[PDB]
C-alpha cells in the first residue's frame, strides 16, 4: 500500500508531479519500485505542487465520478502533461516494464482534502490527494 513515509498528499506528488526522467519508462521506475508492481497508467502533470494547491483553492465542484463528494476542483485551465501508458509488462522485474508516453495539454479536476496536521507542511491547509480526471 501507499508507502508509510508519505502522506496522501506526498504520494500524490510522488506519482503525479515529480517526473524524475524525461522518459516514462524511466520516470515510472521510482514509482513502481515502491510496491514492485507497475501501474497500468500514470499521468504526470508538468506543473508544481504549489500550483496544484492553488487549484485546490478554486470553487469546489461535485466530483464527476462520485456525486456524493464535493471536494473536487477544476483546474483553471489546460496544463501541460505527460501520460504514461503501460504497453509491456514485466512481473519478474518492474525495471523492465515499458511505457508509451503521450504529451498533451488538458484541463484536470483534482480532489483535495485537509492536510495531515502532523506531517504535511502547515503552509498548505488544503492539499491535492486524488486526480479525479483529465480532459
Amino acid at each position: 500500500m501507499k508507502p508509510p513515509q508519505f502522506t496522501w498528499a506526498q504520494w500524490f506528488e510522488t506519482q503525479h508531479i515529480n517526473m524524475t526522467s524525461q522518459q516514462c519508462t524511466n520516470a515510472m521506475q521510482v514509482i513502481n519500485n515502491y510496491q514492485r508492481r507497475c501501474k497500468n497508467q500514470n499521468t504526470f502533470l508538468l506543473t508544481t505542487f504549489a500550483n496544484v494547491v492553488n487549484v485546490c483553492g478554486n470553487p469546489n465542484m461535485t466530483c464527476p465520478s462520485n456525486k456524493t463528494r464535493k471536494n473536487c476542483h477544476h483546474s483553471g485551465s489546460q496544463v501541460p502533461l505527460i501520460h504514461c501508458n503501460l504497453t509491456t509488462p514485466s512481473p519478474q522485474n518492474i525495471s523492465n516494464c515499458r511505457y508509451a508516453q503521450t504529451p498533451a495539454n488538458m484541463f484536470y479536476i483534482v480532489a483535495c482534502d485537509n492536510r495531515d496536521q502532523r506531517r504535511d507542511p502547515p503552509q498548505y491547509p488544503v492539499v491535492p490527494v486524488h486526480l479525479d480526471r483529465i480532459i
Binding site: 500500500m1 521506475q29 497500468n40 463528494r69 509491456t88 509488462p89 512481473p91 490527494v129
Partner: protein, 456 residues
C-alpha cells in the same frame, strides 16, 4: 551472488560499505542510485580486481561521457569476461561512443549491451558499429531505444547484421528511422547469416508497405520469437501483408506486439486466421487499436476453438463495451490456455464486469492475471468480484486501479480476500480515492493475510 540496488540515494557511509561488493559479486546492478562521475573511480578500481564479473548494470545514473569512460576503463583487463552491460540513460553522447566502441573489440564474452535513452545520434552509432564489426566482438543482443537515430543509421546497422551470425536481438524502437530506414534494416536481416530471435521497432515510422518486407522475415527466420511493432501506422493493410508470413509453417513466433497500429475489426479478422493456425503464438497485444465489440467477438470465437493456445492477451483501450463481456465470459470458463487478460481502459461497466465474473468463477478456469483498471467499475461489481475471488482458484493478480470503489465495495472485497480460501496474491488499487475507513480496513488485511499484497 549479486549487488542489486535500484532507486536509492547512497550516502557516503553506505557507498563505503558497498564498495567491497563491487569487487566480489558476479552481478553488479546499481540502477538509478544517484551515481555520478565523482564515484566512477571507485567503480572502475573495483571492477579491475573483481575475479568473476559477469554483469554490470548502471542504468539511470548521470555519469556523462567522462564518467562512462572512467567506468569502462575497469573492463579493460585481459581477464574481464563480462557478459552483460547496460549504460542505459547514463548521459552518454555520440562523442563518448569512441571508447565504448574500442572496449567492445576486446570483450568477446560480451553478449548483451543496452544503450537506450542516450542521445548517441547517427555519428555515435557509426562509431559503435565500427567496434561491433570487429571480428573479436561477438555481441548477440543490442538495445538502442531513444538514441536519436535516423534512417542514416540503418545502413551501418545493416552491415553489422550481414557480418554477425551470432546476432539474436536488435531493438531500435523509438527512433525516427522511418520507412526508408526500416526497409534497409529488413534487407540487412534478409541478407544476414544470423538466427534473429527478437526484432523490436516500436514507434519507428514503420508503414503498411514495410509490412511486406517484414512478412518475408517472419516467413524465413524460423528462429524468430518476438516481433514488437507497436505505435506504427500499419493499419489493416499492414496486417494483411504480415499474416501470410505469420501463417508460414516454419514460423514459431511466440510474441506479437502490435498495439496502436491503426488496426480495426477487419485486420483483427485476418489475425484470427493466424491465431487458429499457430499454436506457437503465446503473447499478443492489440491494445490501443479501435477493435470494438466486433473485434472482441472475433477474438473470443477464435479463443474458443482448438489450436489457439494464446497465453496472454493485451486488449486495453480497444473500445470494448459491456456487450463483449458475455463473449469473454465464455472464454474465461472454457479456454484452458489464456492466463492473462489485460482489458483495462474499456467501458465494460459493472454490467460487463459482473458477466466476466460468472465465467471466471467456474471450476476449470485457469486465468491467473486480470487487469480491469479504469473500466468504469464501481461498488456494484464488488459482490460478484468477491464471490469469484473465492470460487476461482487460479487467479493470483487482480488490478482494479482507476475505478471509483467506495467503503461498501472495499468491505465486500476484503470480506472475501481475507479468507483462507482466497488464493489471490496481489490486489492492485492504484489511483482510487480513499476514505479513512477504506484505508484502515485494507491495512489490517495486509497483516491478517501475509500472502496478500494490497497495492497503493
Amino acid at each position: 551472488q549479486s549487488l542489486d540496488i535500484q532507486c536509492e540515494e547512497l550516502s557516503d557511509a553506505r557507498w563505503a560499505e558497498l564498495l567491497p561488493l563491487l569487487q566480489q559479486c558476479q552481478v553488479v546492478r546499481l540502477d538509478d542510485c544517484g551515481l555520478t562521475e565523482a564515484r566512477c573511480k571507485d567503480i572502475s578500481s573495483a571492477l579491475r580486481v573483481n575475479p568473476a564479473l559477469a554483469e554490470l548494470n548502471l542504468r539511470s545514473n548521470e555519469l556523462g561521457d567522462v564518467g562512462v569512460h572512467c567506468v569502462l576503463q575497469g573492463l579493460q583487463t585481459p581477464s574481464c569476461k563480462i557478459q552483460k552491460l547496460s549504460l542505459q540513460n547514463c548521459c552518454l553522447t555520440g562523442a563518448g561512443c569512441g571508447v565504448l566502441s574500442s572496449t567492445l573489440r576486446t570483450l568477446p564474452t560480451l553478449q548483451e549491451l543496452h544503450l537506450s535513452d542516450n542521445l548517441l545520434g547517427d555519428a555515435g552509432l557509426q562509431l559503435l558499429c565500427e567496434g561491433l564489426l570487429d571480428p573479436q566482438c561477438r555481441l548477440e543482443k543490442l538495445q538502442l531505444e531513444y538514441c536519436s537515430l535516423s534512417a542514416a543509421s540503418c545502413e551501418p546497422l545493416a552491415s553489422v547484421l550481414r557480418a554477425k551470425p551470432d546476432f539474436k536481438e536488435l531493438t531500435v524502437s523509438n527512433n525516427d528511422i522511418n520507412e526508408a530506414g526500416v526497409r534497409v534494416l529488413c534487407q540487412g536481416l534478409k541478407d544476414s547469416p544470423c538466427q534473429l530471435e527478437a526484432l523490436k521497432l516500436e514507434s519507428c515510422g514503420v508503414t503498411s508497405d514495410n509490412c511486406r518486407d517484414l512478412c518475408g522475415i517472419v516467413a524465413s527466420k524460423a528462429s524468430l520469437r518476438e516481433l514488437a511493432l507497436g505505435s506504427n501506422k500499419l493499419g489493416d493493410v499492414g496486417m494483411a501483408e504480415l499474416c501470410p508470413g505469420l501463417l508460414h509453417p516454419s514460423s514459431r513466433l511466440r510474441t506479437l506486439w502490435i498495439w496502436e497500429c491503426g488496426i480495426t475489426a477487419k485486420g483483427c479478422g485476418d489475425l484470427c486466421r493466424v491465431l487458429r493456425a499457430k499454436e506457437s503464438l503465446k503473447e499478443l497485444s492489440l491494445a490501443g487499436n479501435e477493435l470494438g465489440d466486433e473485434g472482441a467477438r472475433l477474438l473470443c470465437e477464435t479463443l474458443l476453438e482448438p489450436g489457439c493456445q494464446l497465453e496472454s492477451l493485451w486488449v486495453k483501450s480497444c473500445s470494448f463495451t459491456a456487450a463483449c463481456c458475455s463473449h469473454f465470459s465464455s472464454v474465461l470458463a472454457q479456454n484452458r490456455f489464456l492466463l492473462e487478460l489485460q482489458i483495462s481502459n474499456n467501458r465494460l461497466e459493472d454490467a460487463g464486469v459482473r458477466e466476466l465474473c460468472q465465467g471466471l468463477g467456474q471450476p476449470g478456469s485457469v486465468l491467473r492475471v486480470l487487469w480491469l483498471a479504469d473500466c468504469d467499475v464501481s461498488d456494484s461489481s464488488c459482490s460478484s468480484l468477491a464471490a469469484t475471488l473465492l470460487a476461482n482458484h487460479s487467479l493470483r493478480e487482480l488490478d482494479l486501479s482507476n475505478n471509483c470503489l467506495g467503503d461498501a465495495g472495499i468491505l465486500q472485497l476484503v470480506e472475501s480476500v481475507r479468507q483462507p480460501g482466497c488464493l489471490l496474491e496481489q490486489l492492485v488499487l492504484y489511483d482510487i480515492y480513499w476514505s479513512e475507513e477504506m484505508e484502515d480496513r485494507l491495512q489490517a488485511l495486509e497483516k491478517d493475510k501475509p500472502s496478500l499484497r494490497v497495492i497503493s
